[model samples]
Target: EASICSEPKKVGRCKGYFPRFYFDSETGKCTPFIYGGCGGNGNNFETLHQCRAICR
Candidate 1:
């Protein structure tokens, strides 16, 4: 699949695009970004995929 866009939606907010596949300092990899979870914590995209295919 093609990669998502990297433009910042709001000023001072970090863009959701995956810039690095793996972190050098720490062995960590950020999976495909969750677009709606900026500022808020705890909520994620897991349930998003479980919904009806048409809703996806």
Candidate 2:
């Protein structure tokens, strides 16, 4: 099985368009990171507040 962060979520992708947030179980908070424009998981969010609303 894969980790939650590795799971694929429905987000847009394109050249130079890699913005995302992921849940960090270790810290119990949502953290900001860069997306590769594809192959990500549902644990991803669009904004820090968005991720915090769910994870934090």
Candidate 3:
């Protein structure tokens, strides 16, 4: 199967924590994201480098 790294959607406003990172297959790079501290896809990452390291 193909890799599942893709852009995440705005589920809702972040209740806590700061911004996060995720792999954007569209751009073939890691992008900044705000994790809602709950539900999210597998694309989510803790850092840009981490996302690229795995996705890129």
Candidate 4:
């Protein structure tokens, strides 16, 4: 017999782009921007974004 899993599965991992960036005309670097957590159950990244926010 096969076993069934009920817990959330590790589908994929996401990595945020550049956090600290400089504006086109700014002399200072912009504040760091995080894309939040990025992992879901094999679905599109968008789904993960929404789920985490609500889960928190």
Using TM-score as the measure, which candidate wins?
3
lDDT of 4 by residue, 1-56 (tens): 11111223332355654222111113221222333245433212234344333332
- lDDT, candidates in the order shown: 0.27, 0.67, 0.67, 0.29
Q: What tens-digit string does per-residue lDDT give for candidate 2 at 1-56?
A: 23555444435464456778887767766777777677556887889887776665
Residue by residue across 1-56, what tens digits does model 3's lDDT show? 22546545443555866587777657766778667777666777777777777777
Which tens-of-lDDT digit does each residue in 1-44 have in candidate 1? 11111212221255564222211113222223334325422212
Question: Listing every candidate in turn, what is its Cα RMSD in Å to the true structure after a full C-alpha superposition?
Answer: 11.1, 5.1, 2.7, 14.9
Q: Give Cα distance to truth, residue 3, candidate 1, Å.
A: 32
Better candidate by TM-score, 2 or 3: 3
How badly does each model clash, as a count of residue pairs?
Answer: 0, 4, 0, 0
* Ranked by TM-score, top first: 3, 2, 1, 4
- Considering only N, C-alpha and C atoms within 3 Å, which residue pairs clash in candidate 2? 7-40, 7-41, 8-40, 8-41
The per-residue C-alpha lDDT of model 3 at residue 14 equals: 50
Off by over 4 Å in 4: 1-46
lDDT for model 4 comes to 0.29
Task: Please say which candidate is ahead in lDDT: 1 or 2.
Answer: 2
The number of the candidate with the highest lDDT is 2
**Cα error of candidate 3 at position 10, Å:** 5.9
